[PDB]
Structures are given as C-alpha cells and as structure tokens.
Amino acid sequence: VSSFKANGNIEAKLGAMSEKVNAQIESFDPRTIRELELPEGKFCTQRSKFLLMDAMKLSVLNPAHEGEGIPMKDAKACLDTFWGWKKATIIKKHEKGVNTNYLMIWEQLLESIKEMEGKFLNLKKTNHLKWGLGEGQAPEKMDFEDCK
Amino acid sequence: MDVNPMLIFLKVPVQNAISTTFPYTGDPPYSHGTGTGYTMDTVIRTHDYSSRGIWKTNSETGAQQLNPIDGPLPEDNEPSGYAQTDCVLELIEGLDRSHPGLFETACQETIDAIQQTRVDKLTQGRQTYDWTLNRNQPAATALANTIEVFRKNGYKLNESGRLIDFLKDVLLSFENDSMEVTTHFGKKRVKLTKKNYLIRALTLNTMTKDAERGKLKRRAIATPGMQIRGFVYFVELLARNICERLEQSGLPVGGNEKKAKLANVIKKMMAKSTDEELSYTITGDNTKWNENQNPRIFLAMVLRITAGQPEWFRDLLAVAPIMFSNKVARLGRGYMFESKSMHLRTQISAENLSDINLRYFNEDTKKKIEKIRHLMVEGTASLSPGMMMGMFNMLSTVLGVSVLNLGQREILKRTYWWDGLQSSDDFALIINGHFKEDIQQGVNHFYRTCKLVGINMSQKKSYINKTGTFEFTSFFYRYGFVANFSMELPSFGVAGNNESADMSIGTTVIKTNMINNDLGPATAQMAIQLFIKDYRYTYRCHRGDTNLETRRTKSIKRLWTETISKAGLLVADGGPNPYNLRNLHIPEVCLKWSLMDPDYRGRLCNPNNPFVHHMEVESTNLAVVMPAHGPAKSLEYDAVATTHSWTPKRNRSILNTNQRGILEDERIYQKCCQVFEKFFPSSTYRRPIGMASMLDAMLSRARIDARIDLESGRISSQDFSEITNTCKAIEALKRQ
Amino acid sequence: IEHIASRRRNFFTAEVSQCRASEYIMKAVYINTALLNSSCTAMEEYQVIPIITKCRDTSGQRRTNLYGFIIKGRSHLRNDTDVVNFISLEFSLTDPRNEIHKWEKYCVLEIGDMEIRTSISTIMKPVYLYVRTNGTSKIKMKWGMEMRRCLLQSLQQVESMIEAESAVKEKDMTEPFFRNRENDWPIGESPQGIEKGTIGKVCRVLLAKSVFNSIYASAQLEGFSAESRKLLLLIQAFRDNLDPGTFDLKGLYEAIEECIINDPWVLLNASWFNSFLKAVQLSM
Amino acid sequence: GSGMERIKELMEMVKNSRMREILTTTSVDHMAVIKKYTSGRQEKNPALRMKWMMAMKYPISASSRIREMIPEKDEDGNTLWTNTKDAGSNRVLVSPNAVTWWNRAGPVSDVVHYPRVYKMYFDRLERLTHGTFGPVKFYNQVKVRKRVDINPGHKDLTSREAQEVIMEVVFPNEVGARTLSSDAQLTITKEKKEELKNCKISPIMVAYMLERELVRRTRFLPIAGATSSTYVEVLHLTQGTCWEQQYTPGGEAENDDLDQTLIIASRNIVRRSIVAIDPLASLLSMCHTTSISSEPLVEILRSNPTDEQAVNICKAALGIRINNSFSFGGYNFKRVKGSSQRTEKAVLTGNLQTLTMTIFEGYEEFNVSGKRASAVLKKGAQRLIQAIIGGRTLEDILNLMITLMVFSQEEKMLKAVRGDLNFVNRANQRLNPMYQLLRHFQKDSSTLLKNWGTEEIDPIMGIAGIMPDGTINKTQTLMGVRLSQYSFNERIRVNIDKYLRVRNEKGELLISPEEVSEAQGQEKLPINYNSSLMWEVNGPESILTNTYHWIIKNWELLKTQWMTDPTVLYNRIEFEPFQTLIPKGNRAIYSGFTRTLFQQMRDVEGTFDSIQIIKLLPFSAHPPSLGRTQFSSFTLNIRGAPLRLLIRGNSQVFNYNQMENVIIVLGKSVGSPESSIESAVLRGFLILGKANSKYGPVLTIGELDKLGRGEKANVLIGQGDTVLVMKRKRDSSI
RNA sequence: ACCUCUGCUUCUGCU
RNA sequence: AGUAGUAACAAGAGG
Ligand SMILES: CN1CN([C@@H]2O[C@H](COP(=O)(O)OP(=O)(O)OP(=O)(O)O)[C@@H](O)[C@H]2O)c2nc(N)[nH]c(=O)c21
Ligand SMILES: Nc1nc2c(ncn2[C@@H]2O[C@H](COP(=O)(O)OP(=O)(O)OP(=O)(O)O)[C@@H](O)[C@H]2O)c(=O)[nH]1
Ligand SMILES: Nc1ccn([C@@H]2O[C@H](COP(=O)(O)OP(=O)(O)OP(=O)(O)O)[C@@H](O)[C@H]2O)c(=O)n1
Ligand SMILES: [Mg+2]
Ligand SMILES: [Mg+2]
C-alpha cells in the first residue's frame, strides 16, 4: 500500500467487466406507464378503533346536571335522553365470535350503569366478559427443556 | 364527487406540496419479539453478495471467513462485494492528488487527538455490548466493567487516564490464557478461554431497528463492545477530518449547512460547464451499502491515507478494520414457540440454534438456520464481509466521494464528466456532456467504477433528470430547496423531560420551524394553542379557574385563589399562556418575572428546593430527542432552573433480577461522587485531573480550606480544630 | 404580523373546527387519553370508559355527546407494543346487513327504537349497537393522544399556498382566497370529470387525509407513501420538461405494489394514485 | 461551620469498608467514569414515558430531604411524598402535588441574583419590550443560508478563555497553575465577580449561563436581511416566506455592526451611482435619503471615523473631511505616495493550495498607525521594500510586523503557511484570502520568521534590528524591518467630480470608484435607501427577481413601448440596478447583441416571443455597441459567483415553467405573462427548426461567420440541441 | 388458594 | 376471540 502507485488500474478492470454490468437509462413517459396493481382477496373491512360516519350520539344540550365534567355522569345524563330501549337481539354475527357473549356483555353493562354509584365503574369478571377481553388466553410460559 | 387529495398535484408541483406525502401524524412501525430473523437475513445476504470469494478458517477464533476482495469481477447488476484493492487505491490516490496536504493535516489532527483523548470519551456512546456480562449496558457502565475486569486480570495501563493506554490494554488482553469474570448465581468466578474471550471482544450485538419510517419491512442494527469502540472512534475521526475538507462530502454538516453546500455544488458545476453541455442529476441511493462495504478495503484505505506517517499511528488506526474483518454477530434473543394443543409457550435462545432440532421452525427460518450453521461459533455468527449498519459512515463516505472525485474533465478526458455530493450511501451525481449518449456513457462509467469498489447503485431507488430538480435525504430541490414541514410534525408535542424543559422545547420547536421549514404565522399561532393544551393535559396543570378534575386540581386551585397576580403564574402552576409569535424565544420564567407575586417567585426559584436534580454543566439544559429520521440529537433549551425542573422516576424492573446488585453499586458510587463535589465544586463544570485518590484529594482540600476560613474569620478556632481532627481520624481509619 | 396571523387563523379555525374530521380527532384524543390513563392506573380492573365529546353549535350552545362505551381489559402493558384488549359498544342507525364486509369483526345488536315524526304520521327507526373486541398499545395510544397535530399538517400546507400567492401579488391573499370562493384547486372526481374546490375545501380534504393517516397508520402506508413518492417525482420531472429516466422502473413498481396488502386506507391511496395518473395522462 | 458538615459526612463514609475501598482506590481521573456508572438507560421515547408516568401517583424523584421540608399530606389529604427510594439512589418518590405545595407554601428565598445570572435571557425580553414595530410588507425574497451570530452580548472569547475566566469567577481556588494574560479577561472577571458575590444560585447554573453568555455562538440560517445577532434573535418575527415585519429591537447597536453596515451601504450607493447618467447627483440623492436603523446616513457619515474607499467617496460628496486610508488587521493605512492596481492571479500556498487572489501590483508608500504601534512601509508587487516600526512595547511592535509581512503578499509568507488553512469554509463558501493568512501567522509565525531570513545592519545606529527570534539585536535584523520612534489622524478637505473621482485641494487623484471593492456583503443592520434609484427590497438576488417581477406586472404598457418606442424602454431607470450585476466590460456588447436581436424579432414578422423579450430586456439598458460575438449566455455576478443566463430557452437563473405557467428567477416565481422560427437568438441568423444533415455537418456557433445571406447550416446551439439556421438576406441596424 | 415485586431493563446501535 | 404482522401480545417473575 505504501509503495502503491496507480497506473490504469480502474481502466484495465473496466475493460474486463462484462457489458451486462451497466445502468441503462429508460426514458420515462407517464403516458405509456401502467396503473398500479392492487391486491385481490376478500373485501377490506373497517379497523378504526371507533365508528366514523356511522356513529350516532345521545346528546344533552347545555348540560347542568350534578357532575357535569365527570364522564360517567355525563354518560348517564345522555342515556336518560333515550326512552326507546328493547330486548337486545343479535342481527349481525361476528362469524368467528361467541355472539352470545357480546349480547350478555351489553346487558351486564347497561345494568351495571343503572345500578352504579360514584364516579368510576368497574365491571364484574363474568365468563362472557373474560372471553371478550382475552382473559387467560396467553399460553402458559414454560422452560423449553420441559416442553421440547 | 369522490374526494381525491392527490389531484392537487395536477396544479401544484409535487415538491411544493410534498408535505402531504409524509404520513407522520401516525405511529411509525415497530417490531415485536425477536430480531434473530433479521440478523440471520443480513448475515446470509452479506455472504451471498460475496459468495464467489475465498473461505478461510480463522486461526484464533475458528470462524469461517469469506474474502471477496480481488475476487472475480461482477457479471451482472446484482449487488456485489467484489471490491478491487488496486481500484480503491487508485481512487484514494486520486483524492490525495486533488487535495495536496489534506491527508497529512487530517493525520496530524488525529495524532494530536490520540495524545489528548481521555478514556472517558467512550462514556459518550449509547447501549453497548458488554462482554463481561454478555448483555448490553450503558456505555459508561460497559467501560467501567471492562476496566475493572482488565485490572483484575493484570491490564491497567489505562490508569494513566489516556484512551490510547486503554487501547494498549485491549490488544494486550488477547494474550491472556484465561480471562476471569464473575457471574451472579451470589457470586461465581468464571474463566473464559482465550478463544471465548476473543470471540466476545470481536462481537457486535444485534437487535431490530424500531420506529423507522418509509418501509414495509424491518431490519437489524448492531452495537459493538468496548474493545472495538475506541479504535473505530479514531478511524472515524480521521475520516471526518477528511470529509470536512471535501467539497463533495455531505458530512458532518447538518440541515441548513448541508443545503448551503449542495446549492454551492450546483452553482460550481454550472459555472464550470459550457453552455452547449447537457446536465443531468441522479437522485441516487445504493443497494445494501453496509453489507457490501468491506473491512479489508477499509484497511487498505487507512494504510493509504496514513502513508508516510509514524508506524505506531498507522497500526493503531488499522486496528478497527482488522477487528471488523474478524467480527462476529450475536444472533439476538432467539425465538418463541407455542403449542396449540397444550396452550403453552416457551423461549429458545440464539445459542440453541447451533443444535436444536429443526422440526420447530417454519420453512423460511429452517432454511436460514441451515445456512448460518457453518458460520456459528460459541453462539455467534462469523461475519467477515460487510461493515454492519452505520459503523464507518465517514470512511465509507470517503470511498463514495473518491468516485465522485474521479469525474473531473482533466482526469477522464472523455465526452462527459461528473461531480456531485455524497453522504454515506446517498448521493446526487451531476453528469455533463454534449449529447444524451455522452450522459449515458458517463453514468455507465460512474456505475461500473462504483461496482469495482463494492458500491452498488440501487436501480429501483435511483432516477435521473435534467439538472434543476433533485432530492437528497428528504431535502427537495426545485431550482432551490423547498420546505418539508411534515418531516418535523412528530416534534410538535410534549417532549416528556419535565415541565420546565418541555415549555421551552415546545416554543422553540415552533420558532425554529417558522425560520427553517416555512411554518406560516397563523399555523404557528395555532401550534402554540395546541401545544399548551397538550402540556396542560399531560402535566395535569389546567388553568386554576377551570373545573376539570385531576389529582392536581385542588392544590393548583389553592395556589390560584391565593395568588394576587395570576398572570405571573407559570402554566405548570395553573397560569395563563403568555405566548404569541413575538415572544417564542423568551423563557417563560423571564416572560412572567415582573408579573409574579414575589413570594411565589421566591418559592418557585428557591435554589434550596429538593426537586431540581443538577448534574453537570456540560449536560445542563440538554434534552435528547429522536427525530422522525436519523440518529438521536442532543437538544439545547433555554430555561431558568425551578421546582419545575424535576426528574421522573427510574425503571425498577432490575429489582426482580440477578443484576439488582448494580443498583447498590450505583448508589454507593453516586454517594462518593456527591461528597467529592462538596470539596471540589469545579468538578461539576470541568472534569478534575489527577492520579491521587478521591479520599486524599478531599483530605488535602478540607485541611487547607479550614485554614483559610480560619484566617479570613469565616470559622471559629474551635470548629477549625475539629475539622483537622476529623481529618486525622479519617487518615487513621484508612489503615485496615 | 400577529394581527395578520389572527385574521387568517380565524378563517382556519372555522374551516377545521367544523370539519367532521375534527370530530374524529376529538373522539381519538379523548378515547386514547382515557385508555392510557386507565391502562396505567387500573391494571387489574375491567374499567368502563364512556365515549364522550363536547362541541358547540354554530348557534353557540354547548352540547355533550355520548357515542357508546369502551370496556378496558387488564393492562399490564410493559413493552410499548404490548396490547390492552377492550370491548367497544357503539350506537348507530346504520343497518350493517347492507354491507357486511365492512363489519367482519363486529357483532351488531338491535337494542331499541328511535322516533321520527312529520305530518301524515311518523316512523320508528331501529337503534343498533356495534360491538367488538379490539386492542391497542402504549405507542398507539400515545400517538392517538396527539392527533391534533393533524390540524398543523393541513393548515401549514394551506398557509403555504396563501403565502406563495401573497408574495407574487405583494399583498395578503387570505381574504380573497377565503371569500372569492372560486373553484381553484382539483380535489375530486365526479362522473363528469375533475372537480375543483376552494381553499376551504382543500383545508378540510388535507385535514381528512392527515386524520386518516393517523387512524390507519401502518407499515403498508409507510412503504407505499415513500415508494409512490418517487413515481410522483418522476411524473413531475416529465411535466417540468426535464427528460426523466429510470434504471429499474419494474423494480420501483414492485416496491410500491408489495406495500398494498390489506389495509383499506392504503388500498384507497393506491386507487387515488391511479386516478391522478389517468387524469395527468388525459391532460397530455 | 464552613466545612463542618461535609467532613463529618466523610468520616461516616470512611467508616464503611466498601465506601472506603472506593474512595481509596479510585483516582480523581477514574472518577470521571464511575460518576456515570448506571443501570438506568437514557429514555428512548420520553414523550410516551411521561404520558404514562403522569397518570401515576408518585412519578417524581426528589431529594430525601423533601421529607423534612414539606408535609407528608397537604390540606386536602393528598400524599406529597413517600419513603420509596428511586432505583439506584437515595431520592424518594413524590407526587406532583409536592411541587405545587412548595410553590404555594414552601420556603421563600430572595431572587436578587436571578436577573444577573440569567442576564442573557432577560436581555432578550428587554430588547423586545423596548422594540418598535413598523409595517408588514409582502414580497418574494431569496433567503440565502449563511452562518450568523446567535447570542447578543457575548465577549468574543474562545472556549478556553471563557473556561479560564469562569474558573476564576466561580471556582477561583481550583484554577490550577496558569492565570489570565488578557486584560479583557481580567475586567470581565472583576465585573462578573462583583455582580455575583453572595450568590446562592447553584454554581452549575452560573457556570452554564456564563459559558452561554461569554462565548460567541453561530448557526447557519436562511436570512434575507440584517445579520446582526439582535436581528437573528427575532428572525421568526421579522421574516416569513412572503413577508417582512419591519422591526427595531430596543437597545444600542454595536459600533462594529454600524461600521460594517456603513461600508455596505456606501459601496451599494457607489455601485448604483456609477451606472447613472450623473453619478455624483445620484450618489448625493441616495446619501441624503438613506438611513441605517432610522439614523440618517448623512449624520452617520459626519460622526463616524471609518476610513474606506466607498465611505470616503460619500464623505467627499458631502463635504466631510476624510482620512485617506483603509483598515487592515486593526491598523490604519494612509497611502503617502505612489499607487497600484487590482489584479487577480493564481497562487500556490506552502499549504499546497491553488487560489485566485486579488494582488496589488505597483509602487506605494504607507504611513501606518494603531493604538499601540506605528510604522512606515514601502511596497511593490508582493514586495516588502521596507518597514520602519515603533510602539509602546516589544509585543506591540511585533504584532504590527507580523501584519505588515502578511500585508506584503510576499511569496515567503505565502509559502510559509503550515498545517490546516483553507480558503473555503465547510459549506464551500469562499473566505477572505488575506484575513486567513493574518489569523494564521498571528497564531504561529515561527515558520514565517524562520522562512524570512535576516540582514546585516550598518552603524547608522538608531536604525535598530529585530531577529527571527523576536529578539532585540544590534547588528542583524530581518529583511526590510527596522525600529525607531504630527498629523496622521488629520482629516483633509477634498473635491469630487461628476464621476466620483476624489482629489485633494492640489487636485491629485486620491480615490476612483473603480478602486471600490466589488464584494457584495450582507449588512449587520437594516438599510433603507428610501430612494427611487433603489429597489425597495435590498440585495443582488432581489435586483434580479424585482426587475423581472416588475417587467411582468407592467408588461402591457412595456410591450406597447417595445413595439412603438424601444429606445425610451431601454433607457428606463428601473433597469439601472440590474446593470450593476453585469460585468462592466460586457455591458455595451450585451446591449448591442440584445438590441440587434430585438430588432430582428420586429423585422421578421410572426416571430414575437414575450418570454424572450422579458428575459433579455434588462440587458438592453446600456449605450449599445455592435460586434461579431454571438453570445450563448450573459454572465451575471451574484454574490461574487457568476451565473450564466442562456440566450436560448431556460436556465437555472431564469426559466419559464409550462406546468405552473410561471417564470422562475433564482427559484422564485415572479408571476406569468398570460411556428418553429426563432428570430432573437443569433445575430444575423434565423432558427427554422430541428437540424438536418442535408445542409451538412454540425457547426459550433463560433463557425457561422463563414456563411452568406440565405445560406443555412446545422448548429450546436446550446444545451445539447442541434438546429437548422438560416443567415438572413437582410440584417437589422440598431 | 393466597402473598410479593415489576410496567423501557436479558431487546433500542453508528457519524 | 381480538390486537396485530415475517413475531410477538393476549401479564411476567418470585414465594
Ligand atoms: C495588500 N493590500 C490590501 N489593500 C487594501 O486593504 C483593504 C482591506 O483589505 P481587503 O482584504 O481587500 O478587504 P476588503 O476587500 O475591504 O474586504 P471585503 O471582503 O469586505 O470587500 C482594501 O481597501 C485594499 O485596498 C491594499 N491597498 C493597496 N493600495 N495596496 C496593497 O498592497 C493593499
Ligand atoms: N448512519 C445513519 N445513516 C442514516 C440514519 N438514518 C438515515 N440515514 C441515511 O440517510 C438517508 C436519508 O434518509 P431519508 O431520505 O430521510 O429516508 P429514507 O426513507 O431512507 O429515504 P427515501 O428513499 O428518500 O424515502 C438514508 O437513506 C440513509 O442512507 C441513521 O440513523 N444513521
Ligand atoms: N437507521 C440507519 C439507516 C441507515 N444507516 C446506514 O445508512 C446506509 C444506507 O441506508 P439505506 O439506504 O436506508 O439502506 P441500505 O443499507 O443501502 O439498503 P437498501 O438501500 O438496499 O435498502 C446503511 O447501509 C447504513 O450504513 C444506519 O446506519 N442507520
Ligand atoms: Mg441504500
Ligand atoms: Mg440511503
């Protein structure tokens, strides 16, 4: 390296490298290019964390009730604006779910609200609610030696 | 009508609305679980690109080492590591000839640096592979561990405090028959074999890169240990010193300075061109830059750059490339397995991959393991080729620039020529010539020359157009740089340092963006409003007259009801927002100073408060931020230290581990350092120098402080005697 | 300049505050904030979180809105990607059975009836509850908490277009842009062709884009956006008469295309790119 | 008990074997490492982590002593602290309610030192409170990236001088061996030492703030106007993409900044005036209308002692007495007799570096005075013929010698540069050759001194000598260097003619405008010319954009005038600034070319092209001169770098963008106006369309003369294109 | 059962 | 189940 002196080194190896090693330019004309191809499969489905356009609100105007600012109080006040309840039925199944459990979570929820007292509401860990929240679904963790 | 935002581009040039193509209002991608798959991927690909080279078994580690240098020339456009020593040398010689005296100067500066650098320079890294534990640790902790284990095994030249002496210890440590370390079962002494130790010394730990934008799929990064880091540091310093004097280098200049340099290069180029020449620019990127760089080539570069220099320095700088030629990669955390039938899950280690049954793995991973098996050595993978991500950014830059440097008319004497700018693997190449055929030939000459030195232009990532517009590392040029405000969107929020630091950072971000990224005044005003709301919610410091309920409401309400001049309350104390465009550069405490009840002000700014955790001048009013793109940056901010300058609690997970003992060691160390500073306050500003023990210095200082205090009358004669007495008792107690 | 900025800001604050995208922002900020704090403080509790926003009519009155409820699962969230499971339960008048592919993960219940009267008589409408298991993480909750930054992405671009015209005209074009209410930017497509909108519309469209980027953040979106940007840039170079060339256009198309996998937002963005390309082709 | 509590603590620690082991076996040096020993990691996502922790009851870590200093529970029953130790320390976990408690009800200290310690911060607010706002204007302006100062009120110290000073001020007894040479250092120390006595703010913050204050800091920023630090500080407020908010910060200017701005203003005025029909009248007009930060330029010129060629031309015009000198290296240089002339040439340094450099060639004599030293100098072309030098100290005589050796421009100093010295910054920006050399040889002259030589001195004793040592020596000296000891400061009445030539009462030529530096600098302070002769928007880039924007916006009127009355168009006053961007030697030919081409467009009907007209129009504005030169471009000097504007089609400087339908000048839109035959590219020829090998080989441009009326060719016209031209059968007179 | 600890800490690199 | 997406979470560790 210390005595190195260049003398056509690059030129020589450029002359020994196949023409297949190149960066040929292709003229780019957006008039002759194709549209992107989209994947195929089942139709895409909603994955927001909350409803968007299909949402419906229960509203109270100029709220004044005791606890204005406390979420669950505001929530009770909003609920109170709806008279037209009826026995919940399932009308569109979660095909991979235990649809029964969802019905029961709602019924549990509504009841627990109507009965609630205080500012926060924590629900009982029923079997239907556990299921819906993946309670115990983590596999039990073991040493490899013991399950190999 | 269906709304389509992309249709704006029918009227507005893409660069002028580029901001909209950056979706940086959402969470960036993260890996979950192991990176071992990504590590195997890079190991495999790196060998694949060099596969037609020569295999050898390393005499010291037993590692299988692939050498593609001076290998067969590329035969197609696939990424190649077949770099040719003589071609690299020609390029570096070309760089020497274009810049007489540059190598000599950069060497001279590097030598001075080697003489002056303190061992503690290595504390400046982030997470570092710690061979004494076979786990990552903070850089300073990793340094201390190496120093301690070295001295217990008889290496202590580093006691000099000089980095170069620590470097000597490192090389000398490889002669040891069996390096002793201690593991925690209580405490057990473990003896590494000479081979074990060397393998750990040559290790880069690996993990996956999180929070990287713009990519579907993840990749692996690496962290070297302390044996490597001191040597790499000096190679990269030398390379930096060179890059600073190359008109074609994009490093280490940052944002505005980088843009100024690029604009100058275009201006230069155009002045040097004739009016009859065409000019095209490649917006350029390279395929798998790091995997196709080669330590053997870096060794050549270092020897050639340092030609004529003292042999000790040449050999010292050659260490980093040699170590990289002999490196191994830890394979990461392994994999997890699951049994549907038995609802269970388990962790296997990377080390298990040497000999685990292959039935557990998907086909892809089984193939990876099969390929990697012949490389595995005491739990690691041999990786002679490649450099791994970002290890020699500057030296690799020197290689790319050397190709740019070739494009001078008086060297080529062709119907074309080129110049440009390069930063790592990113480049803008400007090619000039009389006809389009000249441009094509020039582009082919540049591309093929790059191939001869293991630089592989990414065909699918690069494009070409007539000079006037181009992109360079997310800077868009349309006859001059335009703004890209969206790059910065993630920095608009609450930084999470503390209440004082965050107010200052938040207002500064707005201001900086008004100056640099065309953040208009109305949006800047709205940015102030949005920041203040987020700060108030984050820190639960809603204005004192509001009726939100938090754990802080009652105490802030009292402060409010009791305050006379409410306009003087800091926002974090439930006060109003004072900020508008005109005062963004004024620290809140200054801005409100004249409006503060004197008692609040005297409390807020009480220097005796227990909240502010001062440490070091050099790290005062410094935050770390992670930009959307690129490395972590230190951020200076302007703020008065108050009770709002507090420190959040530390992680406690280590309490549940065998490493909990470390917490105790830290506490002891800190206690010793704190008391030291009660005797040497200047040590918080600059680092104190000396071979004297901490205790001896404190004793000498107490005595002579007590004597001056006596004469000057700050202290009684009784007090004074007790001080000298306490000193004598300490003197004595120090003899068991 | 502060006075100038506030006048333009009032234009902006209007357009954006009344935009439906801003409703989603507030839902997202409220939900993620509540879920993060609950996740941290109540790790063992199945805690209930009402989905609330508060707004004012243009007619000036405050209103509190309830959309439904979230039930939080346990939440020993350690790594930043660690998941909290939760149930969402959300009111709607939309019958899902008309578009079931939109609702694969949901169990929709019928829970009541809602009145509508007029004159000759009235009509009762069923009230549905859209129920589903879902999940999120500390990283996703943090970003959701910050969704107000979407306002800046839109308004900065809008303000840059106002400023660009203002420089050439040598005066503040804010009022002309907001009031001359002439259709001066292509922002959509009808069956007849390309439709133009005012700067107000551009603001809301760019805001919606930004908000959707945040709701539907993905690696697919990241890769799609970065790779498709190169193709946008190549088109622009052609339209600027700068004689652009590629080295492996096929490989560039494959790099874009592999990022379009299953995400509805990325699928639509890909479709938009195609529409843009066709419209540009037609104009040449 | 000053010292009492800390020694007792130390006693207790040494009673523990572990702590004693550490304190006896850790060098002061090694403390630097163990100080950072930790299991704690630098948070990698602090934003997320804070949002998480702020939900928790006890997220804050506070000193153990909090437990003694505040209640455990507050009035509302909030727990404020707990006894849980934070991992890795003796700090304890506390509530944010503890911070509020402290701020409402904790101990009240006095804050007298706060303003002084945080002066750098408070000064910001002072400047703003006393600032004045003018109007906002809307326009496009190029904001060019340069390095600018960012901290008003620094004391221009290096980091090592600052450290030294701060060590003396804050930690005097830990200073070590060496102490402060500089007197600047010493008076700062005393001032600061006096300001900060009895100060109880943490010394960490005091050192931090002193370091921020005392050291000059810079940054690269896009900046259109005043570059002074007090203006940089409010760049977000005064500059936008399309606007300027006129503003004056409260407080005094620096004398340095004013002097610097005065020179820039005066040069700008001189350069603008030289291109007017009556330079002196135009210069006086501008002098009388111009202000620097609302101060009339006339008053500054009367009261300001700056000696500079353009400044002095302005002083002469105004009847102000001048000291016929300039500044260099802090020394003032009066030319007694002789003269020389500016010529650039290539120059290899001993650094090993090529460099264009303006070098003065000719015989000259200089009286030189500084505040501590003085000399007589005789000069040739890079010739130090002789330097007779005096002053207070040896030191001060030395420092002037260095300066004069460098000022000579001698080869021996050229080829005595050693180590790192470059003539372009990191950003590729050309730097001042002579100031670079001066700063170098003031760092270290040892090579220079040894490379110079010596000389044997006579017995006319009194003509003393100085040795390559720096030593006082009787028989030997350096080469041309001697030592010895009314009216050097004295200001003279001069006269000035219509073309700005300045002469004494005796009528000898003292200053000519061609001796004024061509460097386009950026003013530290705002200049308002308030003049019909100057664009309202300052700067060279702005001359370009303003001129083209103005043509376009007035295009309807200007077009009719191009058709009906060209000569009145060409002579319009709005084109004069633009003339200053054209090299002096090219103005006439560029004009002749342009007028000819424009006449051709008229003669050859159907070949009107408004863009071509707009583009070339400003080049019409000089008495024409016909020639044989075809131009493929015109050169413009912008910031001392030539840009070339292509005659045919678009260039980096000037291009029409079809897609936007705008003209773009230096990257800025300046708005829009809204057959194959090209009449206004070549003098005498027409372009018909694309090349045709029918009519033979492709000729250069500079090979077209050898054709004849009606005869054609193929031409490499520029930017890679080949075209079919025809020599015209009749040509146009203009 | 139940008890205890942990919520970035066996995994976040480089100029 | 659900989140997600090239490998994880769906509590871990210890008693
Ligand atoms: C070696 N020099 C330098 N010099 C004068 O030195 C003065 C300042 O030095 P300079 O390096 O030219 O700076 P200047 O061009 O003013 O700086 P700027 O870059 O701001 O334009 C000029 O006015 C110039 O005339 C000289 N003047 C004469 N007559 N003869 C000389 O030999 C020399
Ligand atoms: N050493 C180092 N280089 C980095 C880092 N981040 C980015 N780079 C380099 O800087 C380049 C510019 O990054 P960007 O253009 O902002 O992003 P990108 O997604 O890689 O680039 P595009 O292809 O333009 O979308 C990268 O392509 C790398 O070459 C980093 O953390 N360390
Ligand atoms: N976070 C990052 C990103 C990039 N790099 C460095 O920058 C180089 C170029 O980055 P990039 O172009 O993104 O990747 P390549 O390795 O070139 O691979 P490819 O372009 O084929 O994806 C990398 O090889 C590596 O040396 C790094 O160190 N850290
Ligand atoms: Mg790359
Ligand atoms: Mg890259």
Automatic annotation (TrEMBL), chain A:
The keyword Metal-binding applies. It comes from the Viruses. GO terms for molecular function: metal ion binding; RNA binding. GO terms for biological process: symbiont-mediated suppression of host gene expression; viral RNA genome replication; viral translational frameshifting. Keywords: Eukaryotic host gene expression shutoff by virus, Host gene expression shutoff by virus, Host-virus interaction, Metal-binding. Influenza RNA polymerase is composed of three subunits: PB1, PB2 and PA. Belongs to the influenza viruses PA family. This is Polymerase acidic protein. The lineage of its organism: Viruses, Riboviria, Orthornavirae, Negarnaviricota, Polyploviricotina.
From TrEMBL, chain B:
InterPro entries: RNA-dir_pol_NSvirus, RNA_pol_PB1_influenza. GTP binds at N393, D426, H629. It catalyses: RNA(n) + a ribonucleoside 5'-triphosphate = RNA(n+1) + diphosphate. Pfam families: Flu_PB1 (PF00602). It comes from the Viruses. Mg(2+) 4 binds at D285, D425, D426. It is found in: Host cytoplasm; Host nucleus. Mg(2+) 1 binds at G284, D285, D426, E471. GO terms for cellular component: host cell cytoplasm; host cell nucleus. Its EC number is 2.7.7.48. CTP binds at R219, K288, W289, N290, G390, K461. This is RNA-directed RNA polymerase catalytic subunit. It comes from Influenza A virus.
UniProtKB/TrEMBL annotation, chain D:
Residues 40-108 form the Influenza RNA polymerase PB2 second domain. InterPro entries: Flu_PB2_2nd, Flu_PB2_6th, Flu_PB2_C, Flu_PB2_CAP-bd, Flu_PB2_middle, Flu_PB2_N, PB2_helical, PDB2_C. GO terms for molecular function: RNA binding. Residues 324-527 form the Influenza RNA polymerase PB2 CAP binding domain. Signal peptide: none annotated. Belongs to the influenza viruses PB2 family. Influenza RNA polymerase is composed of three subunits: PB1, PB2 and PA. This is Polymerase basic protein 2. It comes from Influenza A virus. The lineage of its organism: Viruses, Riboviria, Orthornavirae, Negarnaviricota, Polyploviricotina.
